[PDB]
Design a protein around this ligand. Structure first.
Ligand SMILES: NCc1ccccc1
Ligand SMILES: [Ca+2]
Ligand SMILES: [Cl-]
Length: 223
């Protein structure tokens, strides 16, 4: 997260860290045994880390659970990043409490202008590399489809939306991928891609979760 602020220990209870010897992507807990993340975060040997704040120190409240299965959307395209969504099933159910809780799936899509909370342990610098120890937060509005498509001509599909600031300075970045975009208590987006980080006229692009609610529920129901 570039231009964000320290969230505060366990203030984003649904945030998860995907780990394989190091943090490589974020995710969101949607129920005691399932996590939603980005398809481009897929890899084998994933350990899901819940209740995390400082990812480099065991502080208490953490729950480490191996992924039993990762389900990349069958229509995921790695070149266009369309359908950039993945479901991860935990080997065992997480213990839900005030520090580890699930986030609700949307019943409807969010409109432009809606303020959302984006979080992650991604890069905090636009020009350079600097990874934080503690979870960073960022409040950012969903942009109009017109502005989004003008920023990325011919690259925005109906399954994506832009969020952030056109003047640059605040954005999601590498390492934040797969993380949550929560608006009004509902998971509306998944950190997916963009051109650089916090650059002028190049807002972050996110997977539009409201288009996948039926797919998520039907997939979870059969696994
Ligand atoms: N600034 C958007 C973004 C998100 C994840 C990775 C790279 C860039
Ligand atoms: Ca920790
Ligand atoms: Cl059905």
């Amino acid at each position: 997260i570039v231009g964000g602020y320290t969230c505060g220990a366990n203030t984003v209870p649904y945030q998860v860290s995907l780990n394989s010897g190091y943090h490589f992507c974020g995710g969101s807990l949607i129920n005691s045994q399932w996590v939603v993340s980005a398809a481009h975060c897929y890899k084998s040997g994933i350990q899901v880390r819940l209740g995390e704040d400082n990812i480099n120190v065991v502080e208490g409240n953490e729950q480490f659970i191996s992924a039993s299965k990762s389900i990349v959307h069958p229509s995921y395209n790695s070149n266009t990043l369309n359908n950039d969504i993945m479901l991860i099933k935990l080997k065992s159910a997480a213990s839900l409490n005030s520090r580890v809780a699930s986030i609700s799936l949307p019943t409807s899509c969010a409109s432009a202008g809606t303020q959302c909370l984006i979080s992650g342990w991604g890069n905090t610098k636009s020009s350079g590399t600097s990874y934080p120890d503690v979870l960073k937060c960022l409040k950012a509005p969903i942009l109009s489809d017109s502005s989004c498509k003008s920023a990325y001509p011919g690259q925005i599909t109906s399954n994506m939306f832009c969020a952030g600031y056109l003047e640059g300075g605040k954005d999601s970045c590498q390492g934040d991928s797969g993380g949550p975009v929560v608006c009004s208590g509902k998971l509306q987006g998944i950190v997916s891609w963009g051109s650089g980080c916090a650059q002028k006229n190049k807002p972050g692009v996110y997977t539009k979760v409201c288009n996948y609610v039926s797919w998520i529920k039907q997939t979870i129901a059969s696994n």
